[PDB]
Amino acid sequence: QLVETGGGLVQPGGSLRLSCAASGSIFSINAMGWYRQAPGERELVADISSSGRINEADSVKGRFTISRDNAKNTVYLQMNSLKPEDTAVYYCNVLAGSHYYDEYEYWGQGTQVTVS
Amino acid sequence: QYPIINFTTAGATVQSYTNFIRAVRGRLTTGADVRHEIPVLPNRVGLPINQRFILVELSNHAELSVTLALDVTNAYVVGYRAGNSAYFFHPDNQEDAEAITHLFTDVQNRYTFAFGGNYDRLEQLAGNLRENIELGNGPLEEAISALYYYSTGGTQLPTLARSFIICIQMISEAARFQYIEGEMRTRIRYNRRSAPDPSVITLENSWGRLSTAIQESNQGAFASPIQLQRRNGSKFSVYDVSILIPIIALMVYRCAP
Ligand SMILES: [Cl-]
Ligand SMILES: [Cl-]
Ligand SMILES: [Zn+2]
Ligand SMILES: [Zn+2]
Ligand SMILES: [Zn+2]
Ligand SMILES: [Zn+2]
Ligand SMILES: [Zn+2]
Structure with missing residues (x-):
């Protein structure tokens, strides 16, 4: 139920913008975000609650900007000043649940981002 | 009638609070299912409806009292009663909807909010994140009064959502x-x-x-x-x-x- 857009290959200093929209049973949708995994662990890049809380990896502070359109249940990730270390497969992540925060967890299919 | 655990903020001590949380845990689960030293709540599959819930009655200095309903399968707050009125978070699916009809059956008035009790939505309604909502005995004292006066019309929606955030953290998450x-x-x-x-x-x-x-x-x-x-x-x-x-x-x- 997650449709991701974005991704590609850029040179250092380039920019990508990722998006991922959720549909279906998301009455109690909570935090949406982006993870990244390079070959050889999976790491949280950024997430955002519907209420405005943002978590962000120190590695990308001041370069990546996450935002959310609550009406579309869509989260965006503006990735500027990209560096070779940002190369990985990026997954959108969606948490939902009335009974607890991460009762339901949905993963995107992953889109490749490469910087060189 | 579902098991009831009482707590009062009036003269509350570290020990009275700890006794309360321990009593809540004792009613949420038998503790006979332990994995890697940590007890597990009952499986929802196989759990009969007459064992689905526990009741937490909260009182304060003003002698105002509300009774929270907790789902033993997840310790979360499903709704609450104050006087002749009960209030329930919006159920996710029709199975949760059916379960809560077994709560406060004799209550005169039953109200279902349009929203669920998930933190994101509650923070939107309260107009504040959890990081800016103080916790402690004072906040719990004020949350109890706010929940009570919702039923009389004296508590506005942002205050109500803030009070849920306080109750859920100091009861469910502490459990x-x-x-x-x-x-x-x-x-x-x-x-x-x-x-x-x-x-x-x-x-x-x-x-x-x-x-x-x-x-x-x-x-x-x-x-x-x-x-x-x-x-x-x-x-x-x-x-x-x-x-x-x-x-x-x-x-x-x-x-x-
Ligand atoms: Cl007082
Ligand atoms: Cl009952
Ligand atoms: Zn559930
Ligand atoms: Zn006192
Ligand atoms: Zn073990
Ligand atoms: Zn009394
Ligand atoms: Zn509904």
């Missing part, structure tokens, strides 16, 4: 995490009211994933790490059940043993 119980104990002992820091929030946000990682662990090790934040917001990763045994008091049933 789930002895670390969070410890955080509430510290506030009582230092006559303090203060919002939770990221160490509390990331634990609250990760109970289900932590419960899964523990119950699916092998030789004590997680299949994949779980990331939490320290008090200063810096991230760290847990790979081992041993780190969480002093932290988590109860897990939701995620797998069989």
